[PDB]
Amino acid sequence: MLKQVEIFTDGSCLGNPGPGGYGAILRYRGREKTFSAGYTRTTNNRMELMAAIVALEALKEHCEVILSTDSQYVRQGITQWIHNWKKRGWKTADKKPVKNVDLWQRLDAALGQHQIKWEWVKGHAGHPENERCDELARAAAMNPTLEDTGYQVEV
């Protein structure tokens, strides 16, 4: 029994947008929790966020979290877009609101609580768990039971 929070994210977006969702294998207090929703129209990028976010949100106590994934949206988004955006002051180059700021904020804001362990894995030394994450994703992709509400930024 691993006494640690785990967030293995794996989106289930077939299109872009498309009828998909987001599935992630959570490992919480002596209880493996799963989060596999089903949207109608969303992007893989967003869905990936939804996985990381919902997982974090699911936590009923901001405690150590070890995230595992291999998403570019996150890789760059985090250690490229947020590094610049945040620094600048969560703003764009031409002074504007960030895309998917709501979900981003939830993440960034959430990350700013517990010990984040970004487990970046390539497409070679991948684990079976990750594969299972994708499995759950696909299962969700073929089981829409929600709606993409936060797919706009009217501000």
UniProtKB/Swiss-Prot annotation:
GO terms for molecular function: endonuclease activity; magnesium ion binding; nucleic acid binding; RNA-DNA hybrid ribonuclease activity. Changing D70N: Loss of activity. It comes from the Bacteria. Keywords: Cytoplasm, Endonuclease, Hydrolase, Magnesium, Metal-binding, Nuclease. Disruption phenotype: In a strain that encodes a retron, the msDNA is abnormally sized. GO terms for biological process: DNA replication, removal of RNA primer. Binds 1 Mg(2+) ion per subunit in the absence of substrate. Requires millimolar levels of Mg(2+) for maximal activity. Has low activity at micromolar concentrations of Mn(2+) and is inhibited at higher Mn(2+) levels. Can bind a second metal ion at a regulatory site, or after substrate binding. Its EC number is 3.1.26.4. Its cofactor is Mg(2+). Residues 1-142 form the RNase H type-1 domain. The keyword Metal-binding applies. InterPro entries: RNase_H (IPR050092), RNaseH-like_sf (IPR012337), RNaseH_domain (IPR002156), RNaseH_sf (IPR036397), RNaseHI (IPR022892). It holds the Pfam family RNase_H. CDD domains: RNase_HI_prokaryote_like. Mg(2+) 2 binds at D10, D134. GO terms for cellular component: cytoplasm. It catalyses: Endonucleolytic cleavage to 5'-phosphomonoester. Monomer. Belongs to the RNase H family. Endonuclease that specifically degrades the RNA of RNA-DNA hybrids. RNase H participates in DNA replication; it helps to specify the origin of genomic replication by suppressing initiation at origins other than the oriC locus; along with the 5'-3' exonuclease of pol1, it removes RNA primers from the Okazaki fragments of lagging strand synthesis; and it defines the origin of replication for ColE1-type plasmids by specific cleavage of an RNA preprimer. Involved in production of retron derived msDNA (a branched RNA linked by a 2',5'-phosphodiester bond to a single-stranded DNA). This is Ribonuclease HI. The lineage of its organism: Bacteria, Pseudomonadati, Pseudomonadota, Gammaproteobacteria, Enterobacterales. The gene is rnhA.
